[PDB]
């Protein structure tokens, strides 16, 4: 690994610098190097890992959607044949996206998840596993598409089961997990009713627990609750 010669602490330091410079590919490569040192990640370091790859794959997904939309229009009635270029370039972006997802899933499997025993780390990593299988599912069209979808569902479900047993309903990781699993139901699994039910129950159970929280925790939880509400408003 190209980061094998750099100190773990220096990799974390440079990940933070890359974030300030909005250099998310660098940030992700630094955090990949940090994970491959083999030590567990702290709360802050887990955040750096997720932020880096979320921005990298988010840009790839945005680009893939632009190209897939152009490709779909090219295949409509009355459209001029333009050659293989649009499909080729959509495939190029798609392959690069799949590569990033495979990299993240590889870090989770070797060996972040198996060493994560506390609820806050294990739920975090399983949510990530669900998310990156979800991104693979967004571009999947082949024999293994149903298995990709079920891999996302299985990871999300294990994270949900742990989060409900071990975390308060206002915990931001629990809330963000539920937000994303709800989107998985709506956009991937063709289950809009389950998506709406999960978002509403998650919102209502968090609402009832806000009274236990400090001012600062209240602000964190209500921020993600508003995203649940935004999705519900989008969907109803």
């Amino acid at each position: 690994g190209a980061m094998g010669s750099m100190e773990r602490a220096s990799l974390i330091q440079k990940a933070k610098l890359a974030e300030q410079a909005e250099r998310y590919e660098d940030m992700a490569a630094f955090m990949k190097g940090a994970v491959e040192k083999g030590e567990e990640l702290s709360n802050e370091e887990r955040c750096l890992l997720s932020v880096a790859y979320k921005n990298v794959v988010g840009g790839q997904r945005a680009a893939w959607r632009v190209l897939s939309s152009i490709e779909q229009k090219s295949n409509e009635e009355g459209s001029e044949e333009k050659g293989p270029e649009v499909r080729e370039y959509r495939e190029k972006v798609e392959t690069e996206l799949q590569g990033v997802c495979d990299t993240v899933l590889g870090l989770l499997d070797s060996h972040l998840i198996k060493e994560a025993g506390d609820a806050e780390s294990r739920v975090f990593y399983l949510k990530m596993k669900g998310d990156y299988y979800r991104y693979l599912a967004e571009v999947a069209t082949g024999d293994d598409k149903k298995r990709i979808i079920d891999s996302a569902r299985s990871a999300y479900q294990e994270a949900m089961d742990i989060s409900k047993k071990e975390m308060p309903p206002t915990n931001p990781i629990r809330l963000g997990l539920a937000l994303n699993f709800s989107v998985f139901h709506y956009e991937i699994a063709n289950s809009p009713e389950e998506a709406i039910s999960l978002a509403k129950t998650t919102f209502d159970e968090a609402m009832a627990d806000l009274h236990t929280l400090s001012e600062d925790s209240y602000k964190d939880s209500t921020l993600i609750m508003q995203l649940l509400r935004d999705n519900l408003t989008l969907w109803t």
Binding site: D131, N180, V183, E187, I224, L227, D230, N231, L234
Partner: peptide
């Protein structure tokens, strides 16, 4: 698109 985090 819907919100995710």
């Amino acid at each position: 698109f819907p919100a995710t985090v």
